Amino acid sequence: LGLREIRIHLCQRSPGSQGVRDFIEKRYVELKKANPDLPILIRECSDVQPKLWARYAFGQEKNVSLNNFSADQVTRTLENVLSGKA
Amino acid sequence: VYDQVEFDVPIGSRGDCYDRYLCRVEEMRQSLRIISQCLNKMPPGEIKVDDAKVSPPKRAEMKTSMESLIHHFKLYT
Amino acid sequence: GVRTSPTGEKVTHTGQAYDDGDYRRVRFSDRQKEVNENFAIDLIAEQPVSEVGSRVISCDGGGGALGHPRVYINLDKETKTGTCGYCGLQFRQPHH
Amino acid sequence: GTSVKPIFSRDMNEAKRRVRELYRAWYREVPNTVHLFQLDISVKQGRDKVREMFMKNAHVTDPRVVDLLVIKGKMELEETINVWKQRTHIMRFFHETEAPRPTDFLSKFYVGHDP
Amino acid sequence: SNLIEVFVDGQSVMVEPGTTVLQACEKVGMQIPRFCYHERLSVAGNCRMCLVEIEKAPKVVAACAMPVMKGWNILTNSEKSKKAREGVMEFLLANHPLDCPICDQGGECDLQDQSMMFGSDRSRFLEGKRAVEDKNIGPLVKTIMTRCIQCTRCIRFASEIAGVDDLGTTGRGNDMQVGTYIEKMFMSELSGNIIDICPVGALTSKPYAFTARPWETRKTESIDVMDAVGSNIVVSTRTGEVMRILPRMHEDINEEWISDKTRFAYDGLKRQRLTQPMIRNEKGLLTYTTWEDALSRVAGMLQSFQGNDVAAIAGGLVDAEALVALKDLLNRVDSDSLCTEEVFPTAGAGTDLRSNYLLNTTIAGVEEADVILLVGTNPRFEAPLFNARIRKSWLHNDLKVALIGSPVDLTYRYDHLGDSPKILQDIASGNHPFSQILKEAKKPMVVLGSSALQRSDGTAILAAVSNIAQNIRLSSGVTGDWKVMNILHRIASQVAALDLGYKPGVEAIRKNPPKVLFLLGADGGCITRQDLPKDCFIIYQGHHGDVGAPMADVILPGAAYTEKSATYVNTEGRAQQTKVAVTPPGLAREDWKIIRALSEIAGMTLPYDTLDQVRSRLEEVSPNLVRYDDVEGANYFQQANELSKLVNQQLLADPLVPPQLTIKDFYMTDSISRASQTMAKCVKAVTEGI
Amino acid sequence: PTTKPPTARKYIWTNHKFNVSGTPQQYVPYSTTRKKIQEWVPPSTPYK
Amino acid sequence: TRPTIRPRNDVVHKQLSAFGQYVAEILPKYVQQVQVSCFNELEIFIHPDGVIPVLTFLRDHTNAQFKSLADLTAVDVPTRQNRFEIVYNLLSLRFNSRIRVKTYTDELTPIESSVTVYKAANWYEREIWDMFGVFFANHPDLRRILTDYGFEGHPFRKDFPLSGYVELRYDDEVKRVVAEPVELAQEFRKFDLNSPWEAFPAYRQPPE
Amino acid sequence: QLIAVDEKLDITTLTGVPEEHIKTRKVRIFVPARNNMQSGVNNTKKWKMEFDTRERWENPLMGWSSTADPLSNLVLTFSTKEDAVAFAEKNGWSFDVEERKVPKPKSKSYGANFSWNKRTRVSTK
């Protein structure tokens, strides 16, 4: 229930990652200034698919696919994870 | 050098054990003949090919000259 | 130059000797440990240094073809003796 | 097409038929092997061992591989029937002097480095 | 385009102008015999072994130095070429000593092999041989100069690659000798490489002498962990023992060379090793125990506590697999106090963006820059091969180098702006001439050393360097993808730990002192028992007895980098893997296996059971850790720079002083090199000549 | 050897030994090299 | 050039080349290649399907009369898609000549048995089956010849280890010989011997 | 006629290899690195397949080096990477492939040793 880290795996030039890329290019910084003590690790995937990882207390974590999402979709799912839902 | 020696080839006619035994005894006699010829015609000279990339050099040369030591080392390793 | 160890085991010229806690020592019970008594380091140290009147000397170990490959040794360093890499014999130039 | 030629069987059905014939022959032979070699095992143990060997190669899906396995099994049966094998050869299937090795991670970690 | 057509034995080849005969021959797979030519050194042309006949020409040419011409037909196997080779080999062997049985070069000698392949099989030399006196150039390179063939490879390497002009030739004619003409040690961070370049047994390794033959050795290709360069190496082992370390060619990283520590620190692994688990007895003394007992004690202590009460510190030689295993294990306890000894600023972007803590230009990119700014670093000793690349660029591309910090000797001429950090702001405000110089630089580089980030004002220094890179990007525009910003690391484990989410620095431990502390090869002495509460449980896992082991309650013997297949990430960001050369001694085990066994003992069993499953977990956490030669990545300099300008902490009025000011501080830096007797000999030799 | 004596050397045995197998003096093989890996010795003083 | 170098014979080279052309002309359905080595040995590379016809021709042809099978063995080259190379050496007493016939197979492709042509083949094929695992169809009695009873694997394959996988000893608890995984007190020591310099320019391969 | 099998080649059941030395082994497919002590390149032409290193221990009686794995000396030669990959796949071994490392072409100029204004001029010969 207690979020500890966020991991975003986005591919460098795959089309399906484009929206995710856009998000990092536009609205990552604001998020970082909203949660200045929260690890948001941005890493690169191989040719498979985008992914978002959310880790919680005591080692529990789950992942949500960000394939073909736009920037609005990734913002929506991210603020869904940061809030006490889903 | 088997083209330079004279000997006969024993031949059987029955194809049985006895003929093969006779052939082997006669081949021993022919071997004595060939050995006599080889003893009389042994020539002088070296006993391995004079090519140090194949045959090892003599010990005296191996302890004297650089190329001989190199070739001895490489041929034995 | 064979010396003994605290357990009494003889020390080889390579310096090998079992420790007190080592169980392998049991292999020498009722038997003996084979040790060669002629330490080559001391024997070659016993040989006198040859003095020659040339900057370069040659060594083949003695006996001609029954020795080692013939090598040439430089004797320019005054405060050192030239040593054969095969035999261990030492050569120098007359000094003082 | 992949253009491959057969050994004996055209597809997996004929291969399975040959497997069943070989299994029948081995099952029939087991009691004679127990009697002739003077084995201390039971007939049930021998038939279970026979069953175990067949199960090991159960996964194979290629008819040529199955054909070769059946050929090897027939060769082994011929060796056994003619008493070309000795008692040691028959008992080698049972690994009676090999100490058991645990498959758990902790047991392997304790004993050594091998995975 | 401009390609010209030549012929090798009648076979047509298209080559660029300026290509030599040897390179044209190489294109069709024909290797010309050589002794003095090295493709990474200046052309000499003195050995004369490369003579080849050009069709319709009466004089043979030196293939290594002669450019090809249009329509030339190179005859590599003609009578003239073979006779030239035989004559040159005869001249080379006339005065060579009969030393092969006692020469360490035997079995891997270019002289021996080329005599076998291109020379005669016998001698007609009926005179006496020359003998020259030996030279002393230090405790690393053994010298027997009667074997010298005067190819001058060592001199050219020393002048060109190492920047040291101590080597030369004295006399002339048959009496010409290679040396220093005075008693002087050729002491350099790259000196040992002259053993490799020397084609004969004239120069050899002193620690390696008389121990092995090349045909005996088994070769394992792996990676070096003595710094963050990630040099590719070959490990030579015989009958379960590590015999020596050799360079392995990687054009992008080290490309033929290794540093002296990388080459001679293998000696340390043979002593002060942890071989068995240890606990504390009734008298507070460390006593050998079984794996079960130590693991049970650690598991009970770990089940006792939870959260902030558990912490871990990762040392400088830890691999990615063990790091992720320990992170998962401490996460199961709901602990997030996973730290490294090396400090990186955490404000702003921090570790969120990879480019914030990487050498983004990459090691190869140094060959394309025209200006490089060095800030608070000593690249010569922190990253010797990176400094070698800088010198290569300085020599061949007329690269301009400027340094901010103490005036160290870098083996090339550089401009010294100063040592105060205020200069950074002066370059960030545009009130410095070097700001103008950077403005007109179309391929500029700024490199900030990790050792300069260890002071309290490291965050402000990073912010100032980011401001300089910002002004470069703004004034000069965007040059495509050049990645001006750069961070130079010195610890092999730092980049992987940052990738996995470890907290850089040890401050979190100081702020919340734990009751259970894990020391994963941590030997920097950053935290002692004074910084921790009494009766604190300390666990050390490693391979050497050093700073960390005597203070621990339980000792868990691990494997060294030569004893496992493990992942290490470059200061570039490139992930590479080592291979097993020998197995861990005694009862020591693979580190991730130790952590997994402990997790199973403690009740929180980790999912992975094999190495492949641990690497799958690594891919889950950070997918770049399983791409084993990739170095390309995205650049997020804009976001990191924007996040770096909201904290305005101030600089300190203290000069930037690198931790290693001279060569003596180079040899012993980590646990393995501190246990090495060869490094101790090097320290004694550099502190006093004698 | 009475008319053709062998060359004298200071290291040649002065007393021949026959085959000693099956006796206490028999040869026993052993490794002639020293220890390869040196272990860490913990300190003898308490740590707290 | 004279004393140490082996002399060459050109009459035999010409005759062998002519006979190779003759055989290739008569049997275009199976002959893929013909070669004459420079020490005067003639080889014919054929498709596997022609094992029986070609051999029969060579055995019974009036101008060939290769009525003796000197040797039959296999060579394993793992880099080839068809792993195994089958080699027949034939001798003609009428014309005092020798010929070599080569074909190929893989692990799963049978080769027709040539026992109907040469009786001597009977054991040779068995050996090939034992050492390499190549199956021969229509063999009168195909089984192991060289290895121990129940031996697993084919030891002459390149990927088979030199010391194998099992070793034998006598066990007193079961009072019999038993087999166990191999353990060696001294591991066999691999030597890396090849020189890094090319020896024979006449055999240099194109750089691809 | 033909039967047209549509499976993947798999000969592990016929090679006689024990199961442990099939599933737990990792093979490496690579072009060997040139020995840095010599300039010859003739040993960097072919592909090599080798097995992962296992434990070696000292023999108690003579101190010799003892092993328990039978594949410690097995090294295979291949013309191409694809051939080695196919062999490893059909033998059931899991493998790691390393791309061939080729030295990049270099621009050599003997005249540059004596440049009028560049740093490439040599101070000694």
Ligand code: SF4
């Ligand atoms: S350098 Fe080479 S040729 Fe000279 S002695 Fe040593 S091994 Fe022999």
Ligand code: SF4
């Ligand atoms: S010491 Fe070695 S590298 Fe230097 S000139 Fe002599 S042979 Fe060449």
Ligand code: FES
């Ligand atoms: S290699 Fe060309 S002269 Fe030496």
Ligand SMILES: [Mg+2]
């Ligand atoms: Mg050398």
Ligand SMILES: [Zn+2]
């Ligand atoms: Zn001597």
